[PDB]
Design a protein around this ligand. Structure first.
Ligand code: HEM
Ligand SMILES: CN(C)Cc1ccc(-c2cccnc2)o1
Length: 465
């Protein structure tokens, strides 16, 4: 054919806005999909975007044509602060250099090794202390979980953890929570279409920008301090390593290693390494309370494999297929980043029988893959069996793509999985979960869905086992 995937006819500037509900972008797009097919074109305001629904379409593009779909598209709210700098929301050589450096440096600081495993186990011990500190009282688990998760990536990028009582630490965590929420609201999704006008208007979006600026200012301040105390021969953290590279690249006019990329890359890792794992833990505990039978089976496995005294360790996962299936099912059901981070084609592309001109933005609908009816028997239910065969052994799925896939896939995946396993296992070894309401009445549908999937606010109690 040589034409763009088909889709609803757009109007000048507003695009397909009148055919979408900003409060329910995923549903709006899936509905349109029913009429046009799994691969179609939508206009988010002036942004022409090719939407990919279901496993095959997503894998065929992002993996079978990985290089062609390896460009980074827009996320207007994050782009407000990043402006094309840093490692996530950037493109070309800049992204390429920053990604190679970040992965190497994260490994240098223990990621994927015993070094970060020990860091996570230690922070998990501090979480257990904090939960015991509540005395079994009903509490909002939100910041208990985020403080613990954030301290892992914080020890890597800033060299030391934050004290749980540090008020500024709480403030940064509120900024992250607030920005993920804003991007998942109707206004945050309206912003994705009309940022050209909205970035200049009063409104909720301005408060969101101020939370991003607050996070940026905090990182700039930390960088300054490291700068004046830096030992080129003994880096303390991610920031020092980057400062050293900047030093070594000072004679290169075209280097990507300069202050703005240092600040933005560090900001990407601080927010990235915090909010998504935190949200997943929070959703996870809610699902476990909605499903006591699953919690009960987790406890049998933990007591048998690990016991009551030693701390869980990452190698324990190989002997714990049920917990591994449970964590996969939480990520599959949570669908935390439902439309991934937009990609864009690097050059003119032929995909299936369509034509995608260079620069065209792409929405890989991860959530449509995680709930693909050809890969999961009951996609709309929380059921760990989705990841187990008949002998209760762990069974992988090609449709398990919460970290996306391809050339710009999440390089925080190994760290995330290690955190999820050790935090879920250590909490559940130590506590049984008590909801403030009957399981039948627990509502696990999300509170907001847009850029992220946000669970409803809730309180619960952690009772020692
Ligand atoms: C449950 C946790 C997490 C989920 C579900 C998740 C998900 C994702 C997704 C869907 C993307 C976009 C991938 C693409 O464009 O194809 C992404 C990218 C990225 N993630 Fe994560 N992530 C998680 C944790 C983390 C953590 C802990 C870190 C940090 C160490 C991190 C760092 C990044 C970075 C730097 C990128 C951008 C990669 C690039 O542009 O080349 N993520 N993540
Ligand atoms: C890190 N993973 C979770 C991908 C992801 C979702 C949202 C963001 C993110 C948002 C602001 C700054 N840096 C990164 O990054």
């Amino acid at each position: 054919k040589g034409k763009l995937p088909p889709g609803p006819t757009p109007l000048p500037f507003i695009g397909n806005y009148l055919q979408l509900n900003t409060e329910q972008m995923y549903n709006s797009l899936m509905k349109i999909s029913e009429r046009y097919g799994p691969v179609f074109t939508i206009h988010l305001g002036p942004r022409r975007v090719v939407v990919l629904c279901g496993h095959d379409a997503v894998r065929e593009a992002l993996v079978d044509q990985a290089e062609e779909f390896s460009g980074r598209g827009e996320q207007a709210t994050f782009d407000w602060v990043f402006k094309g700098y840093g490692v996530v929301f950037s493109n070309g050589e800049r992204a390429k250099q920053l990604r190679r450096f970040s992965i190497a440096t994260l490994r240098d600081f223990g990621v994927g090794k015993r070094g970060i495993e020990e860091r996570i186990q230690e922070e998990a011990g501090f979480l257990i202390d904090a939960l015991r500190g509540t005395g079994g009282a009903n509490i909002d688990p939100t910041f208990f979980l985020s403080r613990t998760v954030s301290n892992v990536i914080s020890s890597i990028v800033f060299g030391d953890r934050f004290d749980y009582k540090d008020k500024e630490f709480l403030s940064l965590l509120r900024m992250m929570l607030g920005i993920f929420q804003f991007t998942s609201t109707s206004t945050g999704q309206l912003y994705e279409m009309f940022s050209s006008v909205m970035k200049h208007l009063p409104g909720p979006q301005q408060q969101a920008f101020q939370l991003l600026q607050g996070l940026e200012d905090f990182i700039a301040k930390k960088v300054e301090h490291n700068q004046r105390t830096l030992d080129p021969n003994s880096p303390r953290d991610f920031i020092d390593s980057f400062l050293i590279r900047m030093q070594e690249e000072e004679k290169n006019p075209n280097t990507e290693f300069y202050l703005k990329n240092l600040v933005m890359t560090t900001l990407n890792l601080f927010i990235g390494g915090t909010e998504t794992v935190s949200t997943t833990l929070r959703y996870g505990f809610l699902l476990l309370m909605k499903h006591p039978e699953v919690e009960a089976k987790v406890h049998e496995e933990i007591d048998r494999v690990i016991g009551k005294n030693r701390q869980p360790k990452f190698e324990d996962r190989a002997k714990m297929p049920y917990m591994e299936a449970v964590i996969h099912e939480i990520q599959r059901f949570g669908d935390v980043i439902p439309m991934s981070l937009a990609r864009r084609v690097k050059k003119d592309t032929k995909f299936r029988d369509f034509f995608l001109p260079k620069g065209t933005e792409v929405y890989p609908m991860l959530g449509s893959v995680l709930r693909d009816p050809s890969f999961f028997s009951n996609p709309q239910d929380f059921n760990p069996q989705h990841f187990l065969n008949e002998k209760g052994q762990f069974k992988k799925s090609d449709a398990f793509v919460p970290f996306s896939i391809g050339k710009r896939n999440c390089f925080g995946e190994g760290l995330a999985r290690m955190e999820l396993f050790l935090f879920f296992t250590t909490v559940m070894q130590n506590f049984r979960l008590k909801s403030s309401q009957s399981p039948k009445d627990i509502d696990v549908s999300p509170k907001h869905v847009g850029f992220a999937t946000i669970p409803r606010n809730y309180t619960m109690s952690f009772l020692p086992r």
